């Protein structure tokens with residue numbers, strides 16, 4: 290499928306058996322999601338954004354479906370304006386930029 | 389052509405007679421560049437992301453050459469840690485996400 294950019298590339302993701310809305314973000318190295326519960330232990334990570342740095346909880350090998358495509362990777366959880374799918378997962382679903 | 393997401397999709401833009409490196413960002417509604425002078429009138433604006441908000445100056449109808457494409461759009465100028473090419477400009481050059 291092809292997604293244009295006239296509107297925000299908001300897609301439905303499934304994580305922990307629940308559907309959520311997330312933004313396909315090519316400007317994000319990592320995937321950052323709003324507060325939620327995830328299994329296992331988490332490690333600390335400091336990530337920088339447009340307004341500065343924040344602290345997030347890093348969970349690895351988390352199953353997450355993005356537009357029906359199954360991925361298994363790192364998911365950071367913390368104070369983000371919206372759920373964002375970064376390059377770590379965009380690459381897993383074979384997404385690229387084309388012009 | 390096709391642009392992989394294995395690394396940050398960085399490109400060289402031309403604006404106001406200066407060469408800058410910028411990030412092709414589908415997660416950015418608008419294009420945001422580090423401090424620089426631009427002609428015309430501007431409006432103060434506040435934009436937010438990870439880490440909070442930053443104040444910027446909004447310039448409209450700005451010409452920017454990118455990937456061999458001369459495109460016009462709004463440019464936000466402020467203390468952004470990285471130069472960002474947002475959807476407002478990405479659409480003009482016919483860039484799309486594909487999987």
Ligand SMILES: COc1ccc(S(=O)(=O)N(CC(C)C)C[C@@H](O)[C@H](Cc2ccc(OCP(=O)(O)O)cc2)NC(=O)O[C@H]2CO[C@H]3OCC[C@H]32)cc1
Pocket residue numbers: 314315316317318319320321336337338339340370371373375413415416417418419420435436437438469470472474
């Ligand atoms: C209205 O117009 C707007 C234009 C742009 C923004 S934004 O930038 O907040 N942001 C919007 C969305 C996250 C809410 C666009 C993102 O793609 C942002 C872009 C970005 C910001 C900073 C940055 O440098 C961080 P440093 O290296 O620590 O100095 C790089 C990219 N990426 C980002 O927040 O990535 C995070 C998720 O992994 C990480 O990848 C790099 C930033 C860390 C909001 C509004």
